[PDB]
Symmetry: C3
Subunit: 213 residues, 3 copies
């Protein structure tokens, strides 16, 4: 993608699972990141759903070089600019709009936007993108929906997210159109609100092993 | 929003139910509006699906000032201008497009447009909107679908419509992201056609009563 | 549209079933085509999902004059221009984009674009289209979705495709808003390579006979 030195494809094929992270207390950012890395998970999506989000991204970026940190829930060019300055390596949006696609295209980091319909995918393809997030996965119609929607597009790859759990992420990873999935079970709130990092690491390891066929 | 004296939020917080009205005979418009008001329902969405629709809005605005009358099935700038001229206090659309959104934001009355996906939600948000219609609610996957779609957006509120009835409207009204719902059961075509306003008033009163949470 | 001698309506109203074709081997096109027509199916959608696609359209348009040959999976003004020159009589897309919609109205052949949501349908209507593909049918919310849409748009007509087979195509065909159905069951891959045109004619024949309501 001309202006992106790091391809969206490389972000999505780094591992089978990209954790959708919600960090409430900035102090838990780094240890949580190092914990995930300890469990074999290197691409971390920090969602812009909390006050400390961007700060969390900046911290992880400077302190956990063994992890590729990025931003999630990026809804517009303003937020894209913010996470880019904070050090995010990639951006994930739950959906897409032309202003976001355009600023991302002209930007320096890869954006992996979510889509729910073929028209949304085609719009994204008009901007040169080939990797997308399928969100909300289950609500969109699960594996069947993704299969139909991926049908007429052989070169497109997806990262299904939304309703994905240890019980069904294998069903998605099995699809040839899928590169990886997104899950929020790796960094449970309760576990993060207790400093139980050993628990996080184990969830990552299980997530990675549970993905290997 | 800057140019709207009456906020979209105000429209949706007025009551738990917004009747989606289809009036075929102009002469029924006023007594219908009075009957609904009598039942405790005053946010009246007159859909642009019949020739007398615009005249209906005008008649109601004039003869039943106590009701907050507006337009539905507004598909483009032209129609939006036409109903605004006719006295509609708000506008509802089953979906959205940039031309409609831009014209609405430039206009004087709130537009509460329908979306089905996150990308459509984001487009509306690009124009500053925060209140939306979720249509067709049931066909889009119902409550589950909406919760998934509303997940990444805490400040957004909805008015789901499409397949909602006394049987399930409390399922929607129970959600934190839902302010109210739209339904067509308060004004059955036969009742309206038969000038049976007692029935309409009863339906409205039962609707308001059953929505209590 | 102003520049379509053969309306989209004409295409969709020709027969009850429109086979979505994927031709891997040129030279399989004509025999397959003739096989379909012999069964009573004249409208053939050749999807741009293979290298020989464009060649198959030209080959079928030359050796089978009665068949109404068209292109499928047309995604951008480039593929549209290509198929048009190759002799496609119409174009079908999985979804729609403004660039594609614009080039279509400027072109010479009718475009029947797919839509999944009311917002996408409205975009298409902003370009004057009245006929649309409903894809992916099942995932979109199947029959009930379509009916929900008929409310605000009673003049729009659809050709639903995706998850439709003899077990359910009648459920769609029964709807007033439906002109015809799209399906792939008329030409089973195995049957093609096996050179079993008889099977194709029987499937096509049963398709038409089964549609009679």
């Amino acid at each position: 993608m001309k202006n992106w030195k790091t391809s969206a494809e490389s972000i999505l094929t780094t591992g089978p699972v990209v954790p959708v992270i919600v960090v409430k207390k900035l102090e838990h950012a780094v240890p949580m990141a190092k914990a995930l890395v300890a469990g074999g998970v290197r691409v971390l999506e920090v969602t812009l759903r909390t006050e400390c989000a961007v700060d969390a991204i900046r911290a992880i970026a400077k302190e956990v070089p063994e992890a590729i940190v990025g931003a999630g829930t990026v809804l517009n060019p303003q937020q894209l600019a913010e996470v880019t300055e904070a050090g995010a390596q990639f951006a994930i949006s739950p959906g897409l709009t032309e202003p976001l696609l355009k600023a991302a295209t002209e930007g320096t980091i890869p954006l992996i936007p979510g889509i729910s319909t073929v028209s949304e995918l085609m719009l994204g393809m008009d901007y040169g993108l080939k990797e997308f997030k399928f969100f909300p996965a289950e609500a969109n119609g699960g594996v069947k929906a993704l299969q139909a929607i991926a049908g007429p597009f052989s070169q497109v790859r997806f990262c299904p997210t939304g309703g994905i759990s240890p019980a069904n992420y294998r069903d998605y990873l099995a699809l040839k159109s899928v590169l990886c999935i997104g899950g929020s079970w790796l960094v449970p709130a309760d576990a993060l609100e207790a400093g139980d990092y050993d628990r996080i690491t184990k969830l990552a390891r299980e997530a990675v092993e549970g993905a290997k066929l």
